[PDB]
Amino acid sequence: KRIVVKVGSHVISEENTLSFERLKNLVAFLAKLMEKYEVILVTSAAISAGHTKLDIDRKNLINKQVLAAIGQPFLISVYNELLAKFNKLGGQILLTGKDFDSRKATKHAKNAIDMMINLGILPIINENDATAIEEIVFGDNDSLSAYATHFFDADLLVILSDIDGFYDKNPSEFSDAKRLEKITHIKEEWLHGTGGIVTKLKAAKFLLEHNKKMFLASGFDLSVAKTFLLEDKQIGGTLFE
Amino acid sequence: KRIVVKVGSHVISEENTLSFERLKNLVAFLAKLMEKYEVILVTSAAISAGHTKLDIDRKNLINKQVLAAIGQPFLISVYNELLAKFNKLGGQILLTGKDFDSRKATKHAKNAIDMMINLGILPIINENDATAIEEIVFGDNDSLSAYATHFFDADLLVILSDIDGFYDKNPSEFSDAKRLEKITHIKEEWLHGTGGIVTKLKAAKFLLEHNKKMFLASGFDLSVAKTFLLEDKQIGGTLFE
Ligand SMILES: Nc1ncnc2c1ncn2[C@@H]1O[C@H](COP(=O)(O)OP(=O)(O)O)[C@@H](O)[C@H]1O
Numbered sequence: 013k014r015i016v017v018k019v020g021s022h023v024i025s026e027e028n029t030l031s032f033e034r035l036k037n038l039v040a041f042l043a044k045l046m047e048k049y050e051v052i053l054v055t056s057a058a059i060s061a062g063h064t065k066l067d068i069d070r071k072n073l074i075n076k077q078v079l080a081a082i083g084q085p086f087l088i089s090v091y092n093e094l095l096a097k098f099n100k101l102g103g104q105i106l107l108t109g110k111d112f113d114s115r116k117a118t119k120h121a122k123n124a125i126d127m128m129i130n131l132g133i134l135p136i137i138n139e140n141d142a143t144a145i146e147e148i149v150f151g152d153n154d155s156l157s158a159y160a161t162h163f164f165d166a167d168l169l170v171i172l173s174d175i176d177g178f179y180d181k182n183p184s185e186f187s188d189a190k191r192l193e194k195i196t197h198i199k200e201e202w203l204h205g206t207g208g209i210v211t212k213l214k215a216a217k218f219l220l221e222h223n224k225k226m227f228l229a230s231g232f233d234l235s236v237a238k239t240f241l242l243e244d245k246q247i248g249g250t251l252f253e
Numbered sequence: 254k255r256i257v258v259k260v261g262s263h264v265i266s267e268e269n270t271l272s273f274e275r276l277k278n279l280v281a282f283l284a285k286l287m288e289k290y291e292v293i294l295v296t297s298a299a300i301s302a303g304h305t306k307l308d309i310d311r312k313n314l315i316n317k318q319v320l321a322a323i324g325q326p327f328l329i330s331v332y333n334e335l336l337a338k339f340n341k342l343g344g345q346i347l348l349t350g351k352d353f354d355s356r357k358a359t360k361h362a363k364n365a366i367d368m369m370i371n372l373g374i375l376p377i378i379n380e381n382d383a384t385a386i387e388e389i390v391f392g393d394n395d396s397l398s399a400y401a402t403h404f405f406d407a408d409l410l411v412i413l414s415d416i417d418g419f420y421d422k423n424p425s426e427f428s429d430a431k432r433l434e435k436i437t438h439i440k441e442e443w444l445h446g447t448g449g450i451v452t453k454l455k456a457a458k459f460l461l462e463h464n465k466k467m468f469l470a471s472g473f474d475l476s477v478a479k480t481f482l483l484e485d486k487q488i489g490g491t492l493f494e
């Protein structure tokens with residue numbers, strides 16, 4: 013069983029810094045996951061990381077690309093210092109949605125990833141923000157992680173988010189919103205920023221169409237994600253299957 | 254006036270370590286060039302950098318991709334530590350030859366690069382070894398650096414190398430080999446590893462055909478390159494124009 017874990021920007025960053033508390037917790041979780049599964053990490057937050065090195069505004073798209081260029085290698089260095097605690101290494105992979113249309117590009121990427129996994133190295137994927145901007149504009153890697161799950165032959169995508177699950181209505185607006193534990197179909201009526209719930213549901217529709225699964229849970233408190241993946245009991249979050 | 258400096262793996266590597274000395278020398282040189290020019294760096298040695306962290310056999314191709322994934326971000330952090338001496342930052346760009354065929358990918362890349370240069374950030378380009386292997390197999394970024402030069406609107410590509418220039422015959426094999434100081438045409442008759450002189454000549458042919466220039470010079474002794482670029486005077490190397 014191979015899983016893809018996707019962590020959004022908010023999960024690993026505050027507005028002016030990286031969240032070392034949350035990164036530490038995530039990395040300890042990934043180290044444990046790696047004993048039980050083959051694990052691929054899809055990370056965001058290169059822009060946050062770059063912003064710690066260069067204080068320019070994030071609204072302009074081209075500014076975001078520059079910040080990502082500066083931030084990406086530093087973000088990887090942070091993951092590597094934290095992984096060192098568990099005697100693990102992380103390898104950087106940059107991909108775009110268009111790479112996934114290419115048999116050749118996908119095959120080369122899968123070769124590297126498969127071998128990393130074989131050596132117990134953690135593959136860490138992010139968008140190539142030099143050549144593509146889709147995930148910077150809208151989605152924050154939700155789609156990229158879904159494509160990775162299918163094309164690298166993983167069984168499950170786990171999205172760790174500031175959203176703890178999918179509800180019958182917006183849970184931040186409506187205190188009576190009820191959590192949907194299981195979704196087997198994504199309604200078209202359900203479908204610029206991080207992407208919100210819509211990019212999460214679009215990723216799920218892609219995965220459902222390729223007979224794969226998605227689990228949506230909190231990256232702020234890892235209890236639900238931990239119990240699902242390590243205790244095989246669902247006590248929160250939404251499973252799409 | 255904009256230039257690409259390409260540094261090969263030999264020039265910044267030793268047998269089982271990075272050449273920190275020659276990197277330091279390179280960065281000091283780049284810091285002075287930035288006073289006079291818009292500068293783009295194309296670097297190799299992600300594989301050497303990775304072998305420093307992971308002891309697997311460098312001769313296998315998929316191993317090289319893995320070593321590059323680990324090494325690339327570490328290599329960038331070493332550039333950054335050296336650039337901090339001049340209060341400079343580097344930003345990572347990963348490209349492939351195939352990216353250069355797409356107008357959209359190249360455009361997104363140039364947008365980021367142009368802005369980095371405006372802001373004073375050094376763009377540091379390498380091949381994306383997840384999705385392409387061409388330069389790993391044969392050429393060591395000669396061709397990628399030629400494409401970068403043309404498509405990001407630089408006037409001159411400087412290749413820094415083992416060899417101090419292009420010669421009328423192989424200077425390793427012949428004591429009377431004469432160095433050709435200026436070259437106006439690439440004879441088709443002149444046309445796996447780092448590539449030898451031929452990938453350098455293919456690069457020059459590409460650039461002459463696009464009304465651009467190339468300077469082949471030593472990366473071990475920077476005097477010829479420094480004098481050529483900072484003192485507009487050729488005392489060595491080969492100029493292609
Ligand atoms: N039906 C719904 N179920 C869950 N969350 C929803 C729903 N409708 C709206 N939201 C809201 O979407 C918001 C944006 O999510 P977002 O911040 O993009 O997640 P991430 O940062 O992990 O991408 C959340 O604050 C959430 O409250």
Ligand SMILES: Nc1ncnc2c1ncn2[C@@H]1O[C@H](COP(=O)(O)OP(=O)(O)O)[C@@H](O)[C@H]1O
Binds near residue numbers: 413416424425448449
């Ligand atoms: N006509 C020539 N001019 C210069 N070098 C040549 C020529 N023919 C063969 N060579 C060989 O090719 C080498 C340059 O290629 P390479 O070792 O790949 O350089 P780099 O260190 O830049 O990767 C030279 O050191 C030389 O031994």
